[PDB]
Amino acid sequence: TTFRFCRDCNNMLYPREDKENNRLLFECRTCSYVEEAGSPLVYRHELITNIGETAGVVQDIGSDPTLPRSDRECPKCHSRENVFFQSQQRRKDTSMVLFFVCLSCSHIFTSDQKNK
Amino acid sequence: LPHFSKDDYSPESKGFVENSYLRGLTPQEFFFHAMGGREGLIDTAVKTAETGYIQR
Amino acid sequence: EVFDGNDIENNETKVYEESLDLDLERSNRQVWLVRLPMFLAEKWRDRNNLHGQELGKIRINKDGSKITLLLNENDNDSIPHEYDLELTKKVVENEYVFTEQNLKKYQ
Amino acid sequence: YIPYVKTIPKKTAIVGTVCHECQVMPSMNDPNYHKIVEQRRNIVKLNNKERITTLDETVGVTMSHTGMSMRSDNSNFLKVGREKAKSNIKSIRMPKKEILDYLFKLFDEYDYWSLKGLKERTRQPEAHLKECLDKVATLVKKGPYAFKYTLRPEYKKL
Amino acid sequence: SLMSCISVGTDPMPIITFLSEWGMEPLEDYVPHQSPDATRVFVNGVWHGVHRNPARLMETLRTLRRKGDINPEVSMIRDIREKELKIFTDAGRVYRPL
Amino acid sequence: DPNEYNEFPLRAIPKEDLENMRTHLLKFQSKKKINPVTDFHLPVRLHRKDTRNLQFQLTRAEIVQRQKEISEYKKLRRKTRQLKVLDENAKKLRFEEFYPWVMEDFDGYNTWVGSYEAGNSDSYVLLSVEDDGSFTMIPADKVYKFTARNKYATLTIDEAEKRMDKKSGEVPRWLMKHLDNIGTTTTRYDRTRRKLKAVADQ
Amino acid sequence: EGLVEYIDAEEEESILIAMQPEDLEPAEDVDPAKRIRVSHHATTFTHCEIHPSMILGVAASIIPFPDHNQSPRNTYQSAMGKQAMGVFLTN
Amino acid sequence: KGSRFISTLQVKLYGREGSSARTIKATLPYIKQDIPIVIIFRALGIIPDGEILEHICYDVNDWQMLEMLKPCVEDGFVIQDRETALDFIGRRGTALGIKKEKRIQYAKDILQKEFLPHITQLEGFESRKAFFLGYMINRLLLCALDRKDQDDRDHFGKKRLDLAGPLLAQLFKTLFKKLTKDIFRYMQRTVEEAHD
Ligand SMILES: [Zn+2]
Ligand SMILES: [Zn+2]
């Protein structure tokens, strides 16, 4: 939804319905600082979520000795060495799909076949 | 166990003892069987008191 | 100097000979906020030392704004005399340097 | 508005502006950088606290000063009992007219006096001073100056 | 167990000072937006600040413990997933040698 | 060594000009640039004072206005007690920082309240650039966090509590816009502006 | 000398430990009487166990071949060894 | 290295998952009511909201946790000053012997000497305490978003064993506290009644 803040007192902005132009304006509730909203979306509430599956991936994820090793094909540099792990979200209904991270180019590629 | 890699779902990684008692247990299998026996002892200890309660 | 606030009786003119206004004419001076290791802070913050003597030279290489220190030998020999002044911000916002001075309660 | 905010005035002056967040790193190529590394290793090696001290002498020698002992205390610390018991008040029966004139003089000096202040002012025995008080004066019972002897209204005019 | 020992606990203050003298930025002047990859540094459960290059710090600390400059009972843990460097010093921790 | 740079020598400050003055560190907190030479209404006043019961204190412009107008108008003892142990330095800090640093401009447009920071105030030193490009070393002692106060017409607490009580309904989204349209509990700068324009019109 | 290291349960969370040096460390016909050894097919170990039998306590170290027993029997023997009879002290 | 007192700080997420008005309230010691978070961060000198959820959220792309902390900043919205927050948290102080103007100093004492006391006891350390509280809330919301599971209470690393050292330490601490109290009582008596 990409919350945006006031540039004066660093408070979050709030939408307004106005009959002057019927356009989406976001206002600061403290110092009356106003701008146009760049998107009609003002609220999103996602129930089933794929965000957090690739969470925790860093530049030195290959330095972890506890992560298992595999020999899958990395389709950006064609490397035969990588680490892998399951989806990092801890929902009871997430799958066993693996997220292979190549160590040569830090490319994250999965093993899901229906999505591919 | 810290002797396995992360996200290992192999039978030996999650408590399948393939050796018999005659051939002896690998230490991971030994610890897993100790966990199972500990569960059995705890269940016996709670079940005796609870069933005596129910019987009285 | 404990004193009553919001004095509209203009008693501050009689009991304080110095002006209460902040002095701003040194605000245009450029200051470098420098963080020191423990030994350098110990020799650069002791009150039994620092009698105004020079401590070193600052080499500012203009090729890539690389700033290095060339300390004098007046302090020690076991410590290094060349140091690298790393910068994480070339422009520091909303940060100034100010001093405090006690007022004159007499006359 | 309220004309009281408790402001402590002090002379203040801006003495410059900072534009560079500077930090000092020791140079790797300096020969004395290894002295700094060894110094930091000595810092993380040294201990700030020492061990306890074990008395290696005979235990009875240590216990001789303890509790049930010959060695009476020779310290003067907090000996308020001996230094407050050395002040003794001794006085005799001075004749009645002199002490009543003294009481009248003190009543003229200030009308209300307690027992202790009057006794330390006149240096007289408590029984005789009490007799000379209730002969010619009385103490307040329920007033704001209660438990203080004041002159009678009959003698107040003089 | 037979080989398990229990830490008696040492002072964490030398460790905190050592961290502060090796690029562990103090928590007072840390901004997450300008340092999004910074690894939080915990000493006995106290967040003391962040470090930009946690791997070099961890290998330095491990070499120091292995050479005995740090007390061997001091346990240092780098969890790479959420970028935390936890260092434990207090007593009561059961450890075993490996 | 060839001199392809500008090697300015570094000198220390004497110890004679360090006693009876303390060189602290200023630090504002705003996403925009704050500059007292431009953004502040001169004269600017900085003193350590009580911040208790703000929005009721008039700034120096209205103070000298009131001074001018009144110049025109006039012309059993408990014996022993426990004494808890406390270190001298922290006691001095607590008594000193019992009142915060508050710096304001003349009209009260920019009121900044200081907060003490002790995290790394001891490891910091100042290298002021001299008039000839040289550097003077000043050992900094304290660092103060300065925050602007009552810039967007902040309010009191009793109204906030009665809005947070559940006897009333949902709090409206644009309440202080309506209140500023009414004209109640404005900024200190606007409150000084109303009195200044009332006095100056006569 | 950095040859052995003290590891607690937090530090166990971020390391990989081998059972035996002669088995799991070097890069990889078998006796049918021996138990099946899995080599874990991965060589990124940071530590190795000193000896796996050292996971037992004092009482369980008395049991001969405790890996060939049902675990509750080992627990019973561990509890029973305190009731054994023998010399407890030489004095 | 202090009074060896144990203070429990609970950061609790009110409202169920099906509920939409999910606000976070923290259980401060010596305070009757559970204070919302934003009031506490403003009481720690972090007045503007942006730095508050900067202390909460370290990844600007993690929009979901920002969404679910939006009702918290909406709830702690009427308070926009540090001193107002200080009065608001000090008015439910469990003292009932403090006046109007001493509420601020009382709440400052509450937040300094026993709010996260394992970090520091001194003043001028509100920034690190605020960062740690933001870290606590970040862990709470990571568990609420199921990015991380709840903490295992049976994990042996999270456990300590009090041996003869620590046990005799706390016992001797209690006994020496009592002995110092007795010495002070004896001193007070021998001054007030003066029998040496
Ligand atoms: Zn605004
Ligand atoms: Zn690749």
Could you give the angle at which helices D96-109 and D115-122 cross, rounded to 10 degrees? Answer: 120
Contact F186, F109 (CB under 8 A): no
The H or E element that residue D104 is part of is helix D96-109
Number of domain units in chain E: 1
User: How far is C101 from A111, CA to CA, in rounded Å?
Assistant: 70
Residues contributing to the annotated binding site of A for Zn(2+): 6, 9, 28, 31, 74, 77, 102, 105
Return the SS3 of H176. Answer: helix
Closest by CA to D124, choosing from D108, D106, D141, D109, is D106
* HSE of A93, CA atoms in CB hemisphere, 13 A: 4
| Contacting residues for F91 by C-beta, under 8 A, at least 6 apart | none
User: Is E3 contained in some domain?
Assistant: no
Tokens 């447009």, located at residue: F109
β-sheet with A34-36: strand ranges across: A13-16, A25-28, A34-36
User: Which residue, among F176, F178, F116, has the nearest Cα to F151 in the 3D structure?
Assistant: F176
* Pairwise CA distance, residues D102 & D136, whole Å: 12
In sequence order, what are the residues at sequence separation of 6 or more whose Cβ sits closer than 8 angstroms to the Cβ of residue F200?
none
Please report, as a single letter, which amino acid is at residue H139: R
What's the rounded Cα separation, in Å, for the pair D42 and D36? 10
**Which amino acid would we find at residue H151?**
D
Contacts for F201 with CB less than 8 Å, ≥ 6 apart: none
Q: Cβ E2–G11 below 8 Å, yes or no?
A: no
DSSP secondary structure, H48-62, as one string: SHHHHHHHH-S-TT-
Q: Which helix (H) or strand (E) holds C69?
A: strand C66-71
Look at the alpha carbons of H54, H58, H61, H62 in this order and tell me if their dihedral is positive or negative.
negative
What one-character DSSP code corresponds to residue D137? E
Q: Determine the topology of domain H1-152 in CATH.
A: 3.90.1110
User: In chain H, what is the straight-line distance between the N-terminal and C-terminal CA atoms, in Å?
Assistant: 35
Amino acid H147 reads R
- The answer to the question of residue E1 being in a domain is no
Q: Which of A35, A37, A24, A30 is nearest to A11 (CA)?
A: A30
Angle at D48 between CA D44 and CA D50, to 5 degrees: 130
Bridge partners of residue D23, in order along the sequence: C35, C86
Looking at residue D51, what DSSP letter applies? P
Contact assessment for residue F8 and residue C32, using Cβ atoms and an 8 Å cutoff: no
How far is it, in rounded angstroms, from Cα A75 to Cα D32? 50
Q: All domains of chain A, ordered by start, with CATH?
A: 1-45 (2.20.25.10), 46-116 (2.20.25.10)
User: How large is the C-alpha radius of gyration of chain C?
Assistant: 21
3-state secondary structure of D119: helix
Q: How was this structure determined?
A: cryo-EM
Query: b/e per residue, F162-186, with b = 16+ CB within 10 A?
Result: ebbeeeeeeeeeeebeeebeeeebb
Distance H60 CA to ligand 1 centre (A): 20
F112 Cβ neighbours under 8 A, 6+ residues apart:
F28, F102, F103, F104, F146, F147, F148, F149
Partners for E (CB, 8 Å, 3+ pairs)? A, C, D, F, G, H
User: Is the Cβ–Cβ distance between F181 and F149 less than 8 Å?
Assistant: no
Rounded-to-integer distance, Cα E29 and Cα D21, Å = 11
For the CA atoms of F160, F166, F172, F175, what is the dihedral angle to 10 degrees?
-20
G70–B37 CB contact, under 8 Å: yes
Note whether F51 contacts H: Cβ–Cβ < 8 A: yes
Q: Do C and F count as touching (3 or more CB pairs closer than 8 A)? A: yes
Contact C94, F27 (CB under 8 A): yes
Domain that holds residue E68: 9-90
Residues in CB range of G70: below 8 A, 6 or more apart: B21, B33, B37
Question: What is the sign, positive or negative, of the torsion defined by CA atoms of E49, E54, E57, E61?
Answer: positive
Does residue H2 belong to the interface with chain F, where contact is any CB pair within 8 Å?
no
Nearest Cα residue in chain F from H105: F98
CA F51 from chain center: how many Å? 9
Residue ranges with strand state E in chain F: 8-12, 21-28, 45-49, 101-104, 111-117, 124-129, 135-138, 143-148
Resolution (A): 6.6
**Which residue has 């434990």 as its token pair?**
E88
Binding site, residues of A? 6, 9, 28, 31, 74, 77, 102, 105
Other beta carbons within 10 angstroms of residue E62's beta carbon come to 16
3-state secondary structure of F88: helix
Cβ count near C49 (within 10 Å): 14
Tokens of H17: 């998952």
Q: How far apart, in whole angstroms, are the C-alpha atoms of residue C35 and residue B22?
A: 68
3-state secondary structure of B28: helix
Alpha-carbon gap: C82 to the closest alpha carbon of chain E (Å):
18
What CA–CA distance (Å, rounded) separates A81 from A76?
A: 13
DSSP state of G82: G
Looking up residue E21, the CATH number of its domain turns out to be 3.90.1070.20
The string of DSSP letters for A52-99 reads: TSSTT--TTGGG-TTS-EE----TTT--S-EE----S---TT-----E
Q: Kindly list the distances between the CA atom of residue H130 and the CA atoms of F100, F191, H52, H63, H83, in Å, as whole numbers in the listed order.
A: 19, 33, 9, 21, 16
- For ligand 1, the distance from its centroid to the CA atom of residue F181, given in whole angstroms, is 17
Q: Is the dihedral of CA A62, A66, A67, A69 positive or negative?
A: positive
**Residue E34, in any domain of the structure:** yes
Cβ-defined contact of H131 to E8 (cutoff 8 Å): no
8-state DSSP, C67: E
Breaks (C-N over 2.5 A) in chain G follow: 28
- Which of H111, F183, F10, F176 is closest to C83 using CA atoms? F10
Flag whether E95 is in a domain.
no
Residue H11, CA distances (Å) to D9, H24, H139, H166 in order: 42, 7, 10, 29
CA A72 – CA A70 distance, rounded (Å):
6
Optimal mutation site among D78, D83, D86, D87, interface H, most CBs of chain H within 10 A:
D78
Residue E35 lies in a domain: yes
- Which single residue is written with the structure tokens 């002995």? H179
The backbone region for H103, taken as left when phi is positive above 0, alpha when psi lies in -120 to 50, beta otherwise, is: alpha
**Strand pairing partners for D25?**
C84
